[PDB]
Amino acid sequence: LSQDFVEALKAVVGSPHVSTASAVREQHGHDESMHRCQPPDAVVWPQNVDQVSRVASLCYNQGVPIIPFGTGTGVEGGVCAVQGGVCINLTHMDQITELNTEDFSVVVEPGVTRKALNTHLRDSGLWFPVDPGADASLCGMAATGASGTNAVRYGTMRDNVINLEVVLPDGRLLHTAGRGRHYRKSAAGYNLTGLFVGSEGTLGIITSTTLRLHPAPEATVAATCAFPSVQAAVDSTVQILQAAVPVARIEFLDDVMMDACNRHSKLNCPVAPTLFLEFHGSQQTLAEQLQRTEAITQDNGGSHFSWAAEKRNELWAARHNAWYAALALSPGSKAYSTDVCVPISRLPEILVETKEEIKASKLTGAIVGHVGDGNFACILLVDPDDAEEQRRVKAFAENLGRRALALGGTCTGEHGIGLGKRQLLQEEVGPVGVETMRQLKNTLDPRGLMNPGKVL
Ligand SMILES: Cc1cc2nc3c(=O)[nH]c(=O)nc-3n(C[C@H](O)[C@H](O)[C@H](O)COP(=O)(O)OP(=O)(O)OC[C@H]3O[C@@H](n4cnc5c(N)ncnc54)[C@H](O)[C@@H]3O)c2cc1C
Ligand SMILES: CCCCCC[C@@H](O)C(=O)O
């Protein structure tokens, strides 16, 4: 990468906000996944949207790939610079604006995390519910199409993103639903907001997100429930959803995951396939939800609910850190994660089959999941140097993905495609789906410089 080009970057953002140092590039060449670090040729920190536009235009016109970077907590190598280029770290733009409590909306820049937003919001009576375990950039969450434990009740990023400010690959500034707009519904033209949610940095750079806020619940009850078998826990989940209980959180941990979380958090739950549950409402509504939900879990051998401010906080902090609890089981290890999502009635079959398949192989694995959405993750520990093990783990992940596709589901409920699921995506949407996605990619990124090598 030429020093004339580097000087042009520094002319936009300032010398301290451009780095070509190997260590700095290496830190920005990977996410939290196993995917091998592929360092960008430079890291740039734009300080405002004008600078984002001018960095993009400079890179695009010079044929230099652009890799948007939020908090680097992604799962599929989205920030790996497989063709080199310029990594754009967006987190110095960290302001919350346009807080409209009366309209339940707010605008956030890429450096705002969920914890920052919800801290800004306490005593407002509002909160933002979409809660991935890592305290990620909210714009990165929009880019990946994230969900979380609260999504079963309060929706995914796709449900809660009302507008996006996007710097297109050649530097033009798009407000997907119109500058400054925020509303509950619209039929005006084609919905551009939904196209950029889940685009993973391959269609443009999200420089702000307009988010739906929600009223804080009147009252909250959290509990855990231990089951004799994976079958029993997942059958309970399906029956709770079919009974239309509006549970706020319903999370599955298999016995391996529950033990891992016990050892990583000093929870001390019975080591067993377990549901973490949370219920929102008034005292009247809570008692009714609890009664209907306990009746279903009782039918399937669930324990009496172990009840959990600090104790629910400890409970969900342990759940949010399940990934690290799993890694802590074999220290030094990395891991791959699957993310299939199936029609809920097929969830017992596939998740029990996954448990059986884990057992029948030399691989080790833990299961945790947003099962209220029909979604779960298999966490598969890999020795970074054992290439024999890595290709069994890859083979296992591909086979699980294909089983989910055979059941009418999707290969990823929330994490995305990145580098790891591109073949599964081709199978999932077929030739006309792939060509159509590629045609959209091409009109927004003709030169193919917007995070190349990802998704398609
Ligand atoms: C412990 C743990 C728990 C997690 N739990 C969940 C969970 O429950 N649900 C879930 O969905 N995910 C979960 N994640 C994954 C991850 O936190 C989410 O995918 C998150 O949305 C990634 O945001 P990020 O800014 O850290 O992404 P990064 O890794 O920085 O980037 C992810 C992708 O988005 C692109 N990108 C990032 N910012 C922008 C932007 N502003 N504009 C355009 N493209 C951009 C990147 O180019 C890349 O392709 C978890 C991760 C960890 C480590
Ligand atoms: C590389 C990070 C992968 C984290 C997988 C588990 C996450 O989805 C959750 O549900 O806690």
Author numbering: 27 to 334, 337 to 484
In the authors' words:
Mammalian lactate dehydrogenase D (LDHD) catalyzes the oxidation of D-lactate to pyruvate. We demonstrate that mLDHD is an Mn2+-dependent general dehydrogenase which exhibits catalytic activity for D-lactate and other D-2-hydroxyacids containing hydrophobic moieties, but no activity for their L-isomers or D-2-hydroxyacids containing hydrophilic moieties. Similar to other members of the VAO/PCMH flavoprotein family, mLDHD consists of an FAD-binding domain, a substrate-binding domain and a C-terminal domain. The substrate-binding site contains a positively charged pocket to bind the common glycolate moiety and a hydrophobic pocket with some elasticity to bind the varied hydrophobic moieties of substrates.
Crystallization experiments show that soaking of the mLDHDFAD crystals in crystallization solution supplemented with the substrates and MnCl2 often yields the product-bound or mixed substrate/product-bound structures. Thus, we prepared the loss-of-function H405A mutant mLDHD (mLDHDH405A), and determined the crystal structures of the mLDHDH405A mutant in FAD-bound form and in complexes with FAD and various substrates (D-lactate, D-2-hydroxybutyrate, D-2-hydroxyvalerate, D-2-hydroxyhexanoic acid, D-2-hydroxyoctanoate, D-2-hydroxyisovalerate, D-2-hydroxyisocaproate, and D-2-hydroxy-3-methylvalerate) at high resolutions (1.31–1.75 Å). In the substrate-bound mLDHD and mLDHDH405A structures, all the substrates are clearly defined in the electron density maps; however, Mn2+ is only identified at the active site in the WT structure, but not in the mutant structures due to the mutation of the metal-coordinating His405. Although the DL-isomer mixtures of some substrates (DL-2-hydroxyvalerate, DL-2-hydroxyhexanoate, DL-2-hydroxyoctanoate, DL-2-hydroxyisocaproate, and DL-2-hydroxy-3-methylvalerate) were used in the crystallization experiments, only the D-isomers bind to the active site, further confirming that mLDHD has high stereo-selectivity for the D-isomers over the L-isomers. Comparison of the D-lactate-bound and other substrate-bound mLDHDH405A structures also reveals no major conformational changes for the residues at the substrate-binding subsite A, and the other substrates bind to the same site and the C1-carboxyl and C2-hydroxyl groups of substrates maintain similar hydrogen-bonding interactions with the surrounding residues as D-lactate. However, along with the increase of the size of the hydrophobic moiety of substrate, the key residues composing the substrate-binding subsite B undergo conformational changes to varied extents to accommodate the larger hydrophobic moiety. Concurrently, the larger hydrophobic moiety of substrate makes more hydrophobic interactions with the surrounding residues.
